[PDB]
Amino acid sequence: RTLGKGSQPPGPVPEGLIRIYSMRFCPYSHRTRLVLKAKDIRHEVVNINLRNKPEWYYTKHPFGHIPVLETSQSQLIYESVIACEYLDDAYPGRKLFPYDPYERARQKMLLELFSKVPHLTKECLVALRSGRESTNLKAALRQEFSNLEEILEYQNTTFFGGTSISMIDYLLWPWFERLDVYGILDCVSHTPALRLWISAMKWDPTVSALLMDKSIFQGFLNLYFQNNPNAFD
Amino acid sequence: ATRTLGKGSQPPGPVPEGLIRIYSMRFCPYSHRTRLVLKAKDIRHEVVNINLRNKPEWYYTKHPFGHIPVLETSQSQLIYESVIACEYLDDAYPGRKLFPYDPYERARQKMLLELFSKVPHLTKECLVALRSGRESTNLKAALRQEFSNLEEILEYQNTTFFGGTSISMIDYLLWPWFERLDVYGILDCVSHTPALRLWISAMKWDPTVSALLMDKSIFQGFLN
Numbered sequence: 001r002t003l004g005k006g007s008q009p010p011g012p013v014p015e016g017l018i019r020i021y022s023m024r025f026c027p028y029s030h031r032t033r034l035v036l037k038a039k040d041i042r043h044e045v046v047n048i049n050l051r052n053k054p055e056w057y058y059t060k061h062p063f064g065h066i067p068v069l070e071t072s073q074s075q076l077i078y079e080s081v082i083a084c085e086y087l088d089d090a091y092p093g094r095k096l097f098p099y100d101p102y103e104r105a106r107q108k109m110l111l112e113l114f115s116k117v118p119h120l121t122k123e124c125l126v127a128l129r130s131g132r133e134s135t136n137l138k139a140a141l142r143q144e145f146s147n148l149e150e151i152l153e154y155q156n157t158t159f160f161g162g163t164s165i166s167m168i169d170y171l172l173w174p175w176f177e178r179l180d181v182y183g184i185l186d187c188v189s190h191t192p193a194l195r196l197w198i199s200a201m202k203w204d205p206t207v208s209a210l211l212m213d214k215s216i217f218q219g220f221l222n223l224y225f226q227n228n229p230n231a232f233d
Numbered sequence: 234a235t236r237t238l239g240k241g242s243q244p245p246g247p248v249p250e251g252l253i254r255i256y257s258m259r260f261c262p263y264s265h266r267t268r269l270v271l272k273a274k275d276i277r278h279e280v281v282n283i284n285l286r287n288k289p290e291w292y293y294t295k296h297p298f299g300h301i302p303v304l305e306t307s308q309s310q311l312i313y314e315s316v317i318a319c320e321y322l323d324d325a326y327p328g329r330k331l332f333p334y335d336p337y338e339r340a341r342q343k344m345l346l347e348l349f350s351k352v353p354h355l356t357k358e359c360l361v362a363l364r365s366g367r368e369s370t371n372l373k374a375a376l377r378q379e380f381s382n383l384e385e386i387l388e389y390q391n392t393t394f395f396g397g398t399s400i401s402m403i404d405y406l407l408w409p410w411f412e413r414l415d416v417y418g419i420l421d422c423v424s425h426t427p428a429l430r431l432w433i434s435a436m437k438w439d440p441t442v443s444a445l446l447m448d449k450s451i452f453q454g455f456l457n
């Protein structure tokens with residue numbers, strides 16, 4: 001259950017566990033939850049009410065952002081990209097970043113190329129749910145997706161890092177999962193390799209294990225856009 | 234310390250095996266950053282300076298929007314921009330490692346980099362304001378606040394440098410903008426942060442920093 005204003009601090013993180021502060025429908029914390037699951041890392045999730053944060057939560061992140069990792073040695077790591085990197089370096093089995101220093105750098109370059117998508121998807125959602133104009137937002141999103149489509153087509157690989165799923169794919173995934181519920185799946189209608197990638201991601205055991213419940217997510221968005229505080233409980 | 238390539242210049246040839254190329258500009262702090270790392274790790278490299286106000290047409294095959302810095306390898310690979318380049322260099326080349334080996338300490342340096350993220354733009358805005366004779370009290374106050382965040386870290390850690398008792402990657406990633414405070418006329422923005430002033434001195438005493446340290450009158454002359 002999500003903690004908010006009035007909730008007591010959780011205790012220290014047990015030895016042999018790492019803690020993630022998250023929220024069930026936040027795509028940034030979804031990144032880091034995929035990495036935790038993909039690496040079979042033993043963890044606990046503490047969900048936070050973003051509209052009505054616990055006052056102690058500002059001791060985990062100064063502006064109360066999520067995600068934050070908290071270790072059994074009381075160390076704090078944030079936000080999502082830095083957390084995912086730490087996890088891959090700190091935990092041994094299944095390495096998600098590639099071995100080649102160049103390929104590692106290329107995945108980080110791809111991540112920069114993706115930097116407008118999160119805000120564009122969110123603005124599209126808000127535009128469609130308020131009845132505001134969305135022609136420009138969708139054209140913009142389609143252009144960002146064409147930039148990704150060119151990479152996949154040029155490489156002739158299913159995934160962004162190659163034939164097998166890797167760190168970059170998990171870093172991009174949360175926003176693609178959301179296209180359906182956001183009502184913007186039409187924004188990949190011009191990008192066939194990207195549509196193949198979505199399907200490949202859905203078949204990934206980690207992705208599949210973390211897929212949101214569509215109906216509950218729609219219910220969250222319905223109360224969120226009515227400005228209801230209960231949306232975050 | 235060599236001439237800059239502009240519009241109508243010829244494309245450079247392939248980077249020879251055993252060298253790496255950096256596309257830079259002599260007074261660009263983002264490129265300065267990457268040049269510091271090249272030098273600190275004793276990496277054999279060539280610096281190719283680009284005319285940012287009149288870019289070579291070919292340079293857009295190195296970066297789609299003609300940004301610097303860019304690294305170009307003997308394998309024809311392109312790596313950009315400054316932070317990704319710095320990390321690539323530290324991982325791809327052996328010898329002196331600038332990031333800590335420890336995953337947490339390494340992540341912490343990246344967190345410090347993020348805390349610094351407003352400083353580059355604020356320093357530039359302060360320069361532009363002071364040079365054009367425009368308002369700057371609020372820009373300076375904002376810069377002092379970011380510098381207070383950095384002061385707090387050094388004071389809490391009680392170490393000379395941001396990564397501990399010796400210089401490491403994080404210090405080199407921050408340095409370019411601090412070198413520039415003097416010439417920018419905003420040294421007064423560290424008058425309240427004593428650990429930060431000590432750090433400025435520690436940095437100037439570092440051999441790599443000192444080797445790349447701009448001549449004040451030359452830099453003054455550029456900014457005209």
Ligand SMILES: N[C@@H](CCC(=O)N[C@@H](CS)C(=O)NCC(=O)O)C(=O)O
Nearest residue numbers: 026027028050065066067079080081
């Ligand atoms: N750049 C950060 C962004 C994280 C972020 O903006 N998370 C959202 C939740 S999805 C947040 O902390 N928002 C809280 C708020 O707006 O009050 C990252 O990559 O993790």
Ligand SMILES: N[C@@H](CCC(=O)N[C@@H](CS)C(=O)NCC(=O)O)C(=O)O
Nearest residue numbers: 261262263285300301302314315316
């Ligand atoms: N985010 C990049 C920024 C690089 C950058 O903005 N460099 C400046 C020169 S110091 C530049 O390319 N400006 C010229 C332009 O915008 O075309 C980095 O971290 O290196």
Ligand SMILES: [Cl-]
Nearest residue numbers: 195198199202
């Ligand atoms: Cl699908």
Ligand SMILES: [Cl-]
Nearest residue numbers: 430433434437
């Ligand atoms: Cl000094």
